[PDB]
Amino acid sequence: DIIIATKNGKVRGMQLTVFGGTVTAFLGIPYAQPPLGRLRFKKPQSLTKWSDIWNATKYANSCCQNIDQSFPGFHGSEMWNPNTDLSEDCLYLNVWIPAPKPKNATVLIWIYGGGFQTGTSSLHVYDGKFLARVERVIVVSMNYRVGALGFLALPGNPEAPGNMGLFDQQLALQWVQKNIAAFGGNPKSVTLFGESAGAASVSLHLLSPGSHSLFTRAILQSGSFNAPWAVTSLYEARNRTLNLAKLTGCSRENETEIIKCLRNKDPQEILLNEAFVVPYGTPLSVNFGPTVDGDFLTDMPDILLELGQFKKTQILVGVNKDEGTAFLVYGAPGFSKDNNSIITRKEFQEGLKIFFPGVSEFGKESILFHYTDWVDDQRPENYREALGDVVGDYNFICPALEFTKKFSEWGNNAFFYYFEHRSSKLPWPEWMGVMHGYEIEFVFGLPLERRDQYTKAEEILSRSIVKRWANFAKYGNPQETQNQSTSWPVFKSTEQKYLTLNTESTRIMTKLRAQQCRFWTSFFPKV
Ligand SMILES: *[C@@H]1O[C@H](CO[C@@H]2O[C@@H](C)[C@@H](O)[C@@H](O)[C@@H]2O)[C@@H](O[C@@H]2O[C@H](CO)[C@@H](O)[C@H](O)[C@H]2NC(C)=O)[C@H](O)[C@H]1NC(C)=O
Ligand SMILES: *[C@@H]1O[C@H](CO[C@@H]2O[C@@H](C)[C@@H](O)[C@@H](O)[C@@H]2O)[C@@H](O[C@@H]2O[C@H](CO)[C@@H](O)[C@H](O)[C@H]2NC(C)=O)[C@H](O)[C@H]1NC(C)=O
Ligand SMILES: O=C(NC[C@@H](O)CNCC1CCCCC1)C(c1ccccc1)c1ccccc1
Ligand SMILES: *[C@@H]1O[C@H](CO[C@@H]2O[C@@H](C)[C@@H](O)[C@@H](O)[C@@H]2O)[C@@H](O)[C@H](O)[C@H]1NC(C)=O
Ligand SMILES: *[C@@H]1O[C@H](CO)[C@@H](O)[C@H](O)[C@H]1NC(C)=O
Ligand SMILES: *[C@@H]1O[C@H](CO)[C@@H](O)[C@H](O)[C@H]1NC(C)=O
Ligand SMILES: *[C@@H]1O[C@H](CO)[C@@H](O)[C@H](O)[C@H]1NC(C)=O
Ligand SMILES: [Cl-]
Ligand SMILES: [Cl-]
Numbered sequence: 170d171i172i173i174a175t176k177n178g179k180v181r182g183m184q185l186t187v188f189g190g191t192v193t194a195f196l197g198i199p200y201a202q203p204p205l206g207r208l209r210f211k212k213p214q215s216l217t218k219w220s221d222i223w224n225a226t227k228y229a230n231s232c233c234q235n236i237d238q239s240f241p242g243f244h245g246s247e248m249w250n251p252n253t254d255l256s257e258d259c260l261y262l263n264v265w266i267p268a269p270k271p272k273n274a275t276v277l278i279w280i281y282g283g284g285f286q287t288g289t290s291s292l293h294v295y296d297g298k299f300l301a302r303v304e305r306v307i308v309v310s311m312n313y314r315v316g317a318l319g320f321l322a323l324p325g326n327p328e329a330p331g332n333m334g335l336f337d338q339q340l341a342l343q344w345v346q347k348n349i350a351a352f353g354g355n356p357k358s359v360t361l362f363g364e365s366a367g368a369a370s371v372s373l374h375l376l377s378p379g380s381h382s383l384f385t386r387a388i389l390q391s392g393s394f395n396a397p398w399a400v401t402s403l404y405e406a407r408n409r410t411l412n413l414a415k416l417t418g419c420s421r422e423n424e425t426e427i428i429k430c431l432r433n434k435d436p437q438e439i440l441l442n443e444a445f446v447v448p449y450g451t452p453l454s455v456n457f458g459p460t461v462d463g464d465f466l467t468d469m470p471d472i473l474l475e476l477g478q479f480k481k482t483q484i485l486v487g488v489n490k491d492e493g494t495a496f497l498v499y500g501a502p503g504f505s506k507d508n509n510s511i512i513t514r515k516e517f518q519e520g521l522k523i524f525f526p527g528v529s530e531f532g533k534e535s536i537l538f539h540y541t542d543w544v545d546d547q548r549p550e551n552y553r554e555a556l557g558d559v560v561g562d563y564n565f566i567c568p569a570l571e572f573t574k575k576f577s578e579w580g581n582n583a584f585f586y587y588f589e590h591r592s593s594k595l596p597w598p599e600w601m602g603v604m605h606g607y608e609i610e611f612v613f614g615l616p617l618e619r620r621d622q623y624t625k626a627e628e629i630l631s632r633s634i635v636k637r638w639a640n641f642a643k644y645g646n647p648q649e650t651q652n653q654s655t656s657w658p659v660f661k662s663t664e665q666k667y668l669t670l671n672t673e674s675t676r677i678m679t680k681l682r683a684q685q686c687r688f689w690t691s692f693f694p695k696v
């Protein structure tokens with residue numbers, strides 16, 4: 170019976186047997202007044218004390234979201250859909266503390282991705298119990314508002330200022346600072362980490378002044394704010410907001426009377442209309458995303474990045490080999506998870522219109538010109554792999570690399586990795602490679618469970634990754650000092666060294682996707 174006194178009330182956890190050991194889990198602790206009623210679309214409000222003992226012993230509600238139904242019954246898609254009830258009342262967080270209760274444990278705060286439209290902390294591949302048991306860190310994850318409920322934007326107007334889900338995240342970081350001391354954790358040693366939109370979120374907390382004092386270091390997995398999907402412009406946000414009013418018959422003239430109208434609507438009416446607020450959409454469509462609100466973000470972030478306006482600290486950044494493949498089976502012609510998707514030059518050009526809709530005829534041509542200069546013109550996989558690389562390089566790898574260059578130019582230590590191992594339990598087909606999001610299980614130490622059908626070499630890779638991640642959190646240095654590991658060097662803007670993670674080797678390489686990223690970063694923004 171482990172009851173902890175938090176600043177808002179007592180909470181009861183539960184005991185977990187992990188690897189012939191023990192971990193104390195606290196699941197679904199509230200951290201804000203539920204944003205229901207007049208609180209929908211508003212920034213989160215601080216909780217009043219409760220007198221009972223809160224039973225934080227099961228995952229809480231996930232936040233409202235549109236589920237991926239593109240491959241029903243398919244684990245590869247459904248492993249990401251929420252595994253608890255959806256509710257507007259969803260601002261809750263979880264804590265895993267090692268047993269015995271530690272003294273001054275480094276805290277790890279996880280933020281999930283999902284395109285800022287979906288995601289939940291209760292996912293099986295976000296279970297922190299392993300990291301607590303193995304590395305005696307404290308793992309924390311929070312739920313935050315996604316989609317229009319968490320990012321509907323009417324800038325200036327506090328009834329929908331934007332970035333509510335980011336302010337959800339930021340409230341939880343606060344909760345840790347005031348309470349994690351009571352759990353054995355060190356508020357002075359908090360490492361943010363996240364993946365995809367979670368990773369974009371982490372980069373934005375590096376830029377938001379109101380988050381500078383709430384964490385120490387940060388790890389960014391396949392995601393950064395400077396990626397083309399991560400920030401909604403003020404133009405897009407208004408057309409999208411206004412469109413969502415038309416789709417609900419909430420079009421009004423007084424800007425506030427519009428919000429009030431959307432607040433008597435049921436969550437499903439708002440969820441259903443989110444698809445169509447963009448006329449033409451891409452598969453990577455973040456209909457309601459982070460914006461330059463003037464509260465969380467004070468300027469456009471690409472400027473702040475360029476001019477050094479961020480928390481000075483260490484960062485750990487990386488990407489996966491085949492980031493782009495996942496998106497090709499969500500709309501690209503000639504593709505499917507159920508064949509090798511050999512496409513033609515015509516299907517390739519067609520796919521560019523899918524992923525680059527509002528782009529000039531000359532822009533699409535330039536993408537084709539730079540990726541379809543093959544070594545062997547006879548290779549049949551040529552156009553299939555090229556569309557994956559296009560998507561992955563444009564949407565993840567080159568923005569992540571550019572973030573890491575820019576951030577490092579102000580003197581902080583950065584470390585870049587390149588995850589290139591395909592999971593043995595990967596459910597998608599093999600032509601899709603080292604897919605977006607399939608390092609997460611390795612980072613959380615799921616292959617450490619022998620009773621799980623993971624190969625042996627996959628255990629060892631997860632163990633070294635979990636070491637390097639934990640050593641980065643505790644010490645700002647992601648090394649594995651004991652088992653004669655390859656030393657991970659700092660990313661410098663000159664040499665641009667990075668570390669490869671695979672089961673065979675661990676190599677030091679330089680200047681990832683060099684040719685590819687001079688195109689996406691120096692040529693293509695001109696179009
Ligand atoms: C800004 O939004 C308008 C409205 O777009 C539509 O809104 C809903 C009716 C929705 O269900 C979708 O059909 C649309 O997103 C955009 O105007 C539309 O533009 C498309 C082509 O761009 C045209 O075929 C439609 O007939 C137009 N409909 C209306 C009502 O105007 C407009 O393009 C958006 N501005 C942008 C994207 O810059
Ligand atoms: C690979 O499959 C795609 C996807 O088509 C679907 O999935 C298949 C496995 C099968 O169930 C089809 O009946 C499905 O429609 C194929 O793309 C389709 O190709 C057909 C014939 O060329 C065409 O009529 C459809 O319009 C295409 N649909 C889409 C969405 O692209 C593709 O031809 C297959 N290629 C290979 C090499 O197997
Ligand atoms: O995550 C998207 N939507 C949510 C949902 O519907 C399907 N995603 C599931 C993801 C969960 C976490 C990370 C791995 C997969 C969407 C996206 C947009 C922008 C940036 C990244 C991802 C997307 C669209 C097509 C294929 C994969 C992902
Ligand atoms: C919280 O739970 C209390 C009982 O917990 C029970 O006993 C402990 C030792 C565990 O075994 C647990 O799984 C059991 O359910 C209730 O008495 C109490 O009323 C509950 N509080 C609330 C607010 O529901
Ligand atoms: C924990 O670490 C900080 C420095 O990181 C130190 O000041 C503090 O005294 C330590 N102990 C406790 C109980 O917080
Ligand atoms: C809109 O309505 C609210 C509430 O009645 C009011 O406070 C606000 O001033 C109004 N704005 C305009 C422009 O009429
Ligand atoms: C190093 O090897 C030993 C086995 O001798 C193992 O117990 C330990 O966990 C390994 N450490 C890492 C980080 O792989
Ligand atoms: Cl899984
Ligand atoms: Cl490669």
Ligand SMILES: [Cl-]
Pocket residue numbers: 514546
């Ligand atoms: Cl050809």
Ligand SMILES: [Cl-]
Pocket residue numbers: 592594595596610
């Ligand atoms: Cl899996």
Ligand SMILES: [Cl-]
Pocket residue numbers: 680681682683
């Ligand atoms: Cl390369």
Ligand SMILES: [Cl-]
Pocket residue numbers: 687688692
């Ligand atoms: Cl060029």
